[PDB]
From a paper:
Halo derivatives 8d (R = F) and 11a (R = Cl) could benefit from both mechanisms, haloalkyl compound 11b (R = CF3) displays strong deactivating properties, whereas compounds 11c (R = CH3), 11d (R = OMe), and 11e (R = OH) have ascending electron donating features. In addition, 11d and 11e could contribute to IMHBs. Fortunately, we could study all compounds generated in this iterative step through cocrystal structures in complex with the hTBD homolog MsCI4.44 These data confirmed that the preferred orientation of the ortho substituent toward the amide NH was preserved in the bound state of all ligands except for 11b. Sub van der Waals distances ranging from 1.3 to 2.0 Å were seen in 8d, 11a, 11c, 11d, 11e, and 11f. Hit compound 11e had to be excluded from further development due to the formation of reactive oxygen species (ROS) in the presence of the reducing agent tris(2-carboxyethyl)phosphine (TCEP). Subsequently, the aqueous stability was determined spectrophotometrically by following the changes in the absorption spectra of the compounds at pH 7.0, 8.0, and 9.0. These data confirmed the known hydrolytic susceptibility of compound 2,14,24 and revealed poor stability of 11e at higher pH values. Encouragingly, even compounds with CRBN binding affinity similar to lenalidomide, such as 11d and 11e, did not trigger substantial degradation of SALL4.
Residue numbers in the entry:
A (entry chain B): 19 to 123
B (entry chain A): 18 to 123
C (entry chain C): 19 to 38, 44 to 123
The structure:
């Protein structure tokens, strides 16, 4: 019964029902090669994003997946990444919890 | 990809996914202390970059036959978990609080 | 590790004094669970009708036991057997352990 919206503009992005426990947990704290730290929640599906660039396997936080940057398709806020090319699931999203706002449908 | 664990507060090198240790079946144990704080602890055979403070205590030990010392990040002082000693097979290991770490490339 | 609580929300469920300790069992899909059996428990909500399907414990039917505080599935209540008539089989990995 709860949806996650872009914190910057309010667009609906994903749903609590779509939380996915990748490696056992839906929440992963991660750091990128530039040493930036993010708190990522995994969701099976999303809507309202815009994925940019071609998929890349380098430094993927999730083994067996390629990633693309995900922006809010409405306002352009960087909300996380889409992952593809694996199995069970084939694809999923890692969204930056602090850039979403959770709320009632 | 996601092979090294760092302190989430400051980036200090702490451990590695390769060093995770399944104690009693699982590397993950969820526990609470006398103050009712719940922790999701990951067991590691090895860790670095910590500062172990105090002398070991067996009081309230979550792990049978081990005494604990508090493990802080050696750089920033954040409480990252506990070192366990005095036990058997293994004698020693680390229990680190998963959400106080950040996972990332080597 | 004398009190057992819901790992998701902390609701008190049972205690080492009530234990009967791990049983390793597989569901029909061959997934591993570590079950602890307790003679007593509290703070659950038992839902639905008893079922004998794939019961791990010969002689007993099960009902689903949820955490009464947050609704997380913590295990099952077993009934209809003998010595004892009833008990709770809770999933070790869904519980948090700590002091009294
Ligand atoms: N110079 C940079 C800056 C940033 C990144 C960056 O954020 N990468 C992410 C992409 C998603 C992922 O799973 N893992 C990462 O490490 C990167 O790969 C190179
Ligand atoms: N007043 C307090 C507050 C907290 C603790 C505390 O976190 N103890 C931990 C230490 C590690 C352990 O295995 N078990 C615990 O229960 C404590 O022992 C006393
Ligand atoms: N979609 C399902 C259906 C059933 C189970 C499952 O764990 N069944 C248990 C019920 C208790 C028991 O004694 N034996 C079992 O095999 C499950 O894990 C998923
Ligand atoms: Zn937006
Ligand atoms: Zn630190
Ligand atoms: Zn609960």
């Amino acid at each position: 019964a709860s949806i996650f919206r872009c914190r910057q503009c309010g667009q609906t992005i994903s749903r609590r029902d779509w939380l996915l426990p990748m490696g056992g947990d839906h929440e992963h704290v991660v750091f990128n090669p530039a040493g930036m730290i993010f708190r990522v929640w995994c969701f099976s599906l999303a809507q309202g994003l815009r994925l940019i660039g071609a998929p890349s396997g380098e430094f993927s936080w999730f083994k067996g997946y390629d990633w693309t940057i995900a922006l809010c398709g409405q306002c352009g806020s960087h909300l996380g990444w889409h992952y593809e090319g694996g199995s069970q699931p084939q694809t999923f999203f890692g969204l930056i919890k602090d850039r979403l706002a959770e709320g009632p449908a």
